[PDB]
């Protein structure tokens, strides 16, 4: 075993007993895991294994995400926080300094987000509809990163709307494009092109466009800067 820093803050790689390499983050709440993930001690510091097949962010990193706008003390608005898988990893990355505002409108699932957010002062859970940022206007502040992973046909438009409410000028947006929940009929690759155009025809500056394959079928993530 060996753990070492990567190009990105608070994000580490492991050499393993057998010779495999897996992403991990620095455990903000030591001894405690959110999903089933492996906990790993190295030189008396504990790390949480970051499975790429579950977390789209881990996926995007392993597909060569140039520069990750999520780091120490960053303020993120997380649309579609779900059960807390990925958001728990951005909590680890951001540390006590920074803040994550998790919006999620499915009660069945916010149920399990609660447990994650109790243990973690970083994360501020919100049971609300990302289509109405007015309904959480009064709890959140403006942010550096708008991380948007919501299953909705007009997902992009939702994201832009939240952006002009909460995203700082020159802030970054990681937008996950779910081809099959925008339209199962259309070609995933035609969808990626037309959604990016919505960002450009607003004023987002497309930095990088990753295809999440192996890890997520019919998915692409866009990194862009709001002006």
């Amino acid at each position: 075993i060996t753990v070492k820093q990567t190009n990105m803050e608070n994000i580490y790689e492991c050499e393993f007993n057998d010779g495999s390499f897996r992403l991990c983050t620095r455990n903000l709440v030591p001894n405690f895991n959110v999903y089933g993930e492996r906990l790993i001690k190295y030189e008396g510091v504990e790390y949480r294994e970051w499975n790429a097949f579950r977390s789209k962010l881990a996926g995007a990193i392993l597909k060569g995400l140039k520069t990750n706008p999520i780091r120490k003390g960053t303020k993120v608005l997380y649309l579609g926080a779900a059960s807390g898988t990925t958001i728990s990893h951005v909590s680890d990355i951001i540390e006590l300094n920074g803040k994550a505002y998790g919006v999620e409108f499915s009660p069945r699932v916010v149920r399990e987000l609660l447990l994650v957010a109790q243990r973690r002062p970083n994360i501020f859970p919100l049971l609300a509809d990302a289509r109405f940022p007015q309904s959480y206007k009064s709890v959140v502040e403006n942010v550096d990163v708008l991380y948007v992973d919501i299953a909705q046909p007009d997902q992009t438009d939702i994201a832009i709307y939240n952006a002009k409410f909460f995203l700082k000028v020159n802030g970054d947006m990681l937008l996950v494009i779910k081809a099959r929940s925008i339209d199962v009929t259309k070609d995933p690759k035609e969808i990626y092109k037309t959604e990016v155009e919505k960002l450009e025809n607003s004023n987002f500056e497309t930095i990088q466009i990753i295809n999440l394959d192996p890890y997520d079928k019919d998915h692409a993530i866009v990194l862009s800067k709001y002006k």
């Binding site: 916010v110 609660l114 957010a117 002062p121 501020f124 859970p125 919100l126 049971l127 709890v139």
Partner: peptide
């Protein structure tokens, strides 16, 4: 604010 959020979603 953390505890408000916790209680507001609860």
């Amino acid at each position: 604010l953390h505890e408000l959020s916790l209680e507001y979603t609860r």
